[PDB]
Structure 1
Amino acid sequence: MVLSEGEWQLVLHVWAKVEADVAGHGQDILIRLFKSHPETLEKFDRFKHLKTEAEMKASEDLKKVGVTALTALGAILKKKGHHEAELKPLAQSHATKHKIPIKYLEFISEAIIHVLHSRHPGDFGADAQGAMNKALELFRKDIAAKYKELGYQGG
């Protein structure tokens, strides 16, 4: 839904590339996020002592956190927009417990795009980038509506 079937096929095609190495993609996405938008690191109490990129890559804790996030995102993307049941628990924890503004979901979306183009340019051209941008936009729009439903504007 929302996206065309062709757009969803592009999203799931590049996501299959991510699934060949979820841990490595998650590490690189979090490292890119923290370098581009350093304020986001303040949400991760157990990563504050990780001062260098090599320390971040060596942290099993960071790797596990990245796999958990990418696993949840992949499950959502595979619903092709039919993801209300998957977004409700994610909104609850990120609005009320971790306190993640929607802007930080934009920041991580940028990092996802960057890493996927860096690793898979032959499978992530302009049409695929646009499709993934629309899929992440839909995810962010719908989770922002769930934030509000819970009483959080997410600004």
Structure 2
Amino acid sequence: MVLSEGEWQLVLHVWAKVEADVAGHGQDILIRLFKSHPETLEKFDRFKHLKTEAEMKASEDLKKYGVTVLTALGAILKKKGHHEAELKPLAQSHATKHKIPIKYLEFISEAIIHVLHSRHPGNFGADAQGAMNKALELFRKDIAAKYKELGYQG
């Protein structure tokens, strides 16, 4: 797939708002993911024992990971599709060490779109949400193709 420059503009305009508070957005997104799809919390040995949202909110480890995820994804989005280098080490670790099925990447993509819609309604109208969705589909598609080269396709 290929996004037009106007679609990348929409994606990078709302991402610039997320970047004013990377740790807060990271928390919201992961909590939305774990509340919606609790099976995903099991991949985290660091904090799969968390039982409630309150515990999740108070976890410093969870907030750190949120920053890790959003910083890596922000660097990929800013490439505007030229992200081959960035995707290599990510696809290897998620396919061979963590073992994250593509389906889980779809789940976190939904959680991102939900939180942007909640926090940034004025910069996340239908067109900007369609463009973010396209940017995340592109990301999943390219990661899925690398999983396959790596021997995992999950």
How does the TM-score come out when normalised to structure 1? 0.97
- CA displacement 1:133-153 (0-9 Å, x = unmatched): 000000000000000011111
The corresponding residue for 1:92 is 92
Deviation at 1:57, TM superposition (A): 1.0
Output the CA distance in 1 between the equivalents of 2:96 and 2:48: 22
CA separation in 2, counterparts of 1:75 and 1:31? Answer: 22
Supply the distance in 1 between the matched residues of 2:2 and 2:69 (Cα, whole angstroms): 23
Question: Structure 1 runs of 4+ off > 2 angstroms?
Answer: none
Deviation track 1:65-94 (CA, whole Å, cap 9, x = no partner) reads: 010010000000000000000000000000
In 2, Cα distance between the equivalents of 1:52 and 1:130?
Answer: 32
Measure the CA separation in 2 of the matches of 1:45 and 1:147: 22
Structure 2 distance, partners of 1:144, 1:40, is: 18
* Structure 1 range deviating more: 135-144 or 44-53: 44-53
Q: Which residue of 2 aligns with 1:80?
A: 80
Equivalent residue for 2:33? 33
Report the Cα distance in structure 2 between the residues aligned to 1:33 and 1:11, rounded to whole angstroms. Answer: 21
* Cα displacement string for residues 21-61 of structure 1 (whole angstroms, at most 9, x for unaligned residues): 10010001000001111110110112123211111111110
In 2, the alpha carbon distance for the partners of 1:58 and 1:22 equals 16
Deviation at 1:13, TM superposition (A): 0.3
TM-score (norm 2): 0.98
| CA–CA distance in structure 1, aligned partners of residues 88 and 4 of structure 2 | 24
Deviations 1:81-125 (A, max 9, x none): 000000000000000000000000000000000000000001100
Unaligned residue ranges in structure 2 (runs of 5+): none
Alignment of 1:1-155 (within 5 A): 2-153=2-153, 155=154
The Cα RMSD (Å) is 0.9
1:16 to partner: Cα distance: 0.5
Measure the CA separation in 2 of the matches of 1:56 and 1:21: 18
